[model samples]
Target: SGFRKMAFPSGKVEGCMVQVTCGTTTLNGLWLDDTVYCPRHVICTAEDMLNPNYEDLLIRKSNHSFLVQAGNVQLRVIGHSMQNCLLRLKVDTSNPKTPKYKFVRIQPGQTFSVLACYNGSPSGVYQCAMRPNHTIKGSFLNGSCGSVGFNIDYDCVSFCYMHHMELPTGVHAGTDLEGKFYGPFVDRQTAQAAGTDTTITLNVLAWLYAAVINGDRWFLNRFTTTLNDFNLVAMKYNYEPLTQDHVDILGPLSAQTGIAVLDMCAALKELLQNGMNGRTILGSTILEDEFTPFDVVRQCS
Candidate 1:
């Protein structure tokens, strides 16, 4: 028997049956030879009844030469029928018939891998940036010698200088939060007058001594990672209010005595560690000498 055929204007079709008919039928249903066909039944909806093989049964118009082309001018795979999706630009394809011709599927929160361009300056190297909201989150291109990974919006360095002297946490606060305070060291009067006891005094001193130790360790660590730096010399400095006798002994030692500087430093550290107050450390007899400063050149006749 010959296969049945039908035509339709719209709606899904079934075997030999077109659901939405547009034109009137010329002939009614009738059996015919296998080779013969009726004009009324010239089209069959049999293919529609079968599970559609989208890959094979592409919508095509048989007008092209030597081959039939699918009517897939802009094919879109849509999962959601409600929202409109955007087409991502292709980095490799510089040329496009129309930028508006780009298409995409709107599957709600579905993510798609898209090629992007970053730092497209003439001299800049292109790098990837995580931009979920169309804004750059991090710049992987620029960083310090110690830093690794992407350059984020906030890091250790950003808030480091918000303190005095633009210090990092290392200089801003002591390692154990027990930092020490040191005078500007301009002269005896400056050092003596600035000697006020407080949490800050301890913090400031800890900061200064911590720096001297950490700085040297940092240098050694860079050159030899395997060989841990043993350059650390523990200064037995402790928190205390300076005193009259303590200062009398240490002040002279630091100024006039030809004693080894280490001895004076040790002695001062010892007195301070014992919590001696300034009155006991520095005697009431305050003497402002007229001698030349350490760094100043003296030409006495």
Candidate 2:
């Protein structure tokens, strides 16, 4: 009995049972096809049974073809019947006849997919930040990446298990959540190439193609299945231990190409398979040196 569970029935009333009668089409849980639908979580309520205006909340998915045209717009509408929904931008359909639109709103405990963008207590919506001098660009994934997916929002570089892990960007050092805090030099010549964001992100993608000769799973999967890219696991066979030759190709074409890749990989795998932390990341001489500093970015924010 000591294993009592937690309770969270805070009668926080949300949208109620709804029903819409657009002529004879009784709108309910799901639409006839996948085109139009209501948020699946919406509970069909008794009182809402007669709320005939519910059709306004139907999520419609349709696009234009214009035949020889090569474009399609994505539309996703949510449910919000207690109030009015608004459509801001105007669209020109080429004709006088126009279609109408609507809008509305939500609540929940504060939560962000961004594990690196939170305050340290009951709240810190934004107070917790990577200290000023801690970053080259002075930003985290959240600063530029939007709410498209959790992987990007929280920085996919370190989290290898994301279905669509941003391997290229994910491997690079950044203020990412649940990530290994490397002192930036982990990819290439971080000290010199620090000015180029594309250099880092691009190189991350670089390692994959270079390593593809070893039968990269991430690459092979995409080659077989078109959409496998959006869904993936971690790098198993692909991240073959960098051979000195591979490292040469990856090294700075302009300056310090780095220690022998064997030496660098040895140091990395040593700390990784055994004991590891920021201490070794820096101590390895592969990931750190004098100028570059490696702190946990306010403890991973």
Candidate 3:
């Protein structure tokens, strides 16, 4: 038989099913439909259950979008609730409606550097959002997307002094033994007082020659890397050759005296390698001159 729909305004409607009679005895005990519905029964969608209105649920969902700060933002992915997370930034420039975006994958303790503008210009203002990769599921605390507004100007200036030399801007050179009280080359008085035996006069001169040649070759190695074929050809043919006047500066050990420059350079690489390894020559520490300058503790900070 058909049953009348029961409307319970109070407690539960499952166990106590009754027929109501307001004025007459006709409405007494009655059976309700098998399915009992409370007055507060609601029809919820999938979205409603996923994003509940509860405080904890709201907080959990909000964790997916983390707040980011600064024009150059450095974010580190933490493990805990946020492992192997993917961060996406939908940058909101002056035009929030149509903005640019970028995404990055970050691991634990790995810092990701983000630049709002590629050209170092101030990146007006922007907004973004973040979410976890598909692998992460169920009540996870994800990062929150954020916004930053900046207006800063950065300045930088660089010059290649070697090619840009002019009067009043000449090269700056220090004394051969700067801040040192003793050296054979300091003066003829100091040289005579120290004498050849005490100062190892020849060893000091050899070190000076090797250092100058090695330093020049090291600089030229870098210089030639930037040269084009045309520049190389021009220097090979058009550059002035070393004249007798240039060799005159070498004095007693000049090329005219049968002192081979090429022979000295040929042994430089071997000397440099052995010098670093603290090799001795003929039972004497001849390479000590090359090692002494770098032995002192220098401030890196």
Backbone collision tally, model 2 = 8
lDDT of 2 by residue, 235-293 (tens): 22122223334345434421232233333333333333344333322113222211100
TM-score for each predicted model, relative to the true structure: 0.15, 0.21, 0.15
Candidate 1, residue 98: Cα displacement in angstroms equals 64
In the range 234-263, model 1's lDDT, one tens digit per residue, is: 122223232333334333324433333333
With candidate 2 superimposed using the best TM-score fit, by how many Å does residue 174's alpha carbon deviate from the native? 22
Rank ordering of all candidates by lDDT, starting from the highest: 2, 3, 1
Query: Which residue runs does candidate 1 get wrong by more than 4 Å?
Result: 1-256, 278-301
Instruction: For each candidate in the order shown, give its overall lDDT on alpha carbons.
Output: 0.18, 0.21, 0.20
Winner by TM-score? 2
RMSD of 1: 34.0
lDDT of 1 at 214: 26
**TM-score of candidate 1 to 2 decimals:** 0.15
How well does candidate 2 match the true structure in TM-score terms? 0.21
Question: Model 3: runs farther than 4 Å from truth?
Answer: 1-65, 71-86, 94-272, 276-301
